[PDB]
């Protein structure tokens, strides 16, 4: 099986999600053919030189999966688009492009984070265009760490003061550009399986869940596609009347 996850939004303020991801990495991921993280692994990222200990704890945990023989891959999300090759080397992860076409046991699948499909949020797309401009990124990354922290903290509060769903035509365009009948993405926090038509044939769009109260993954096997929801921690069973 090949595993897909996204939208964990890891942050030191949410240690239960971190513990859940660590348990996922120690158990399920070790048995996978491969692990793909389709963006928003972290709630924020201001550069690979950030000494945030959560970053090293996560890198070491992913690296243990990689060293166990499971290749791990990363597509950037809207939150953690600054994840770079230093963190890739620390974690053993391979950084992929914003759109990738995979062969999963014979079926061709397009994978992406999903934010680029939400073309009806022109306010977000303007923001995305700005912070994805390379010279703007290079300028931001050159700022002192403590400056980047304050910029990011203010921008998060400014954004706080309702995720738009995908545009149906944008989905078709992407599935026809890549000539695939399968698409896996996250971003929209709406775990689901959708049927559509692309390239004159039935096609499917599979959406990952965010790690809010439970975990979420997509498991692709040679036989089927599985959207799986599971608790963060080990739920120890314990023991009504007739």
Ligand X SMILES: CC(=O)N1CCc2cc(S(=O)(=O)N3CCN(c4cccc(C(F)(F)F)n4)CC3)ccc21
Binding partner at 236 among ligand X, Mn ion, none, C-beta below 5 to 8 Å by kind = none
Query: What would the two tokens of residue 223 be?
Result: 């036989």
Task: Assess 125 for contact with ligand X (CB under 6 A).
Answer: no
Task: Assess 121 for contact with ligand X (CB under 6 A).
Answer: no
Among 2, 18, 78, 116, binds Mn ion (CB under 5 A): 78
Task: Assess 78 for contact with ligand X (CB under 6 A).
Answer: yes
User: What is the SS3 string spanning the chain?
Assistant: CEEEECCCCECCCCHHHHHHHHHHHHCCHHHCCEEEECCCCECCCCCCCCCCHHHHHHHHHHHHHHHCCCCEEECCCCCCCCCCHHHHHHHCCEECCCEEEEEECCEEEEEECCHHHCCCCHHHHHHHHHHCCHHHHHHHHHCCHHHHHHHHHHHHHHHHCCCCCCCHHHHHHHHHHCCCCEEEECCCCCCEEEEEEECCEEEEEEECCCCCCCEEEEEECCCCEEEEEECCCCCCCCCCCC
> Which of 53, 107, 102 lies closest to 75 in space, CA to CA?
102
* Residue 210 Cβ vs ligand X, minimum distance, rounded to whole Å: 14
Query: What would the two tokens of residue 20 be?
Result: 């859940």
Is residue 40 marked as binding? yes
Task: Assess 91 for contact with Mn ion (CB under 5 A).
Answer: no
Binding partner at 230 among Mn ion, ligand X, none, C-beta below 5 to 8 Å by kind = none
Among 151, 192, 228, 233, binds ligand X (CB under 6 A): 151
Residue with tokens 């038509």: 197
The stretch among 11-19, 86-94, 150-158, 195-203 that binds ligand X (CB under 6 A) is 150-158
Binding partner at 156 among Mn ion, ligand X, none, C-beta below 5 to 8 Å by kind = ligand X
Task: Assess 77 for contact with Mn ion (CB under 5 A).
Answer: yes
Binding partner at 44 among Mn ion, ligand X, none, C-beta below 5 to 8 Å by kind = ligand X
Contact pattern for ligand X over residues 25 through 64, marking x by CB under 6 A? -------------------xxx------------------
Could you tell me which residues are annotated as the binding site?
7, 9, 40, 78-79, 113, 121, 159, 187, 189
Binding site for Mn ion (CB under 5 A): 7, 40, 77-78, 115, 187
Binding site for ligand X (CB under 6 A): 44-46, 78-79, 82, 124, 127, 131, 136-137, 140, 151-152, 155-156, 159
């Amino acid at each position: 099986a090949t595993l897909f996850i996204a939208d964990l939004h890891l942050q030191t303020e949410e240690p239960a999600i971190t513990a859940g991801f660590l348990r996922f990495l120690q158990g399920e991921a070790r048995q996978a053919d491969a692990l793909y993280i389709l963006g928003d692994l972290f709630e924020a990222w201001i550069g690979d030189d950030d000494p945030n200990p959560l970053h090293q704890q996560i890198a070491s945990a992913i690296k243990a999966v990689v060293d166990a023989g499971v290749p791990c891959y990363f597509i950037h999300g809207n939150r953690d688009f600054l994840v770079g090759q230093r963190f890739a080397r620390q974690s053993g992860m391979i950084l992929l492009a914003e759109e990738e076409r995979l062969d999963l046991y014979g079926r061709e699948v397009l994978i992406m984070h999903g934010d680029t499909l939400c073309t009806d949020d022109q306010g977000y797309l303007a923001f995305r265009a700005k912070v994805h401009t390379p010279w703007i990124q290079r300028l931001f990354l050159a700022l002192p760490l403590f400056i980047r922290h304050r910029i990011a903290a203010r921008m998060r509060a400014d954004s706080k003061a309702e995720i738009m769903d995908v545009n149906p035509q944008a989905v078709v365009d992407a599935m026809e550009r890549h000539h695939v009948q399968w698409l896996i993405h996250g971003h929209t926090h709406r775990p689901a399986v959708h049927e559509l038509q692309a390239n004159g044939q039935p096609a499917w769009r599979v959406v990952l869940g965010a790690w809010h109260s439970e975990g979420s993954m997509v498991k692709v096997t040679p036989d089927d596609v599985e959207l799986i929801h599971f608790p963060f921690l080990e739920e120890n069973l314990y023991f009504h009347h007739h």
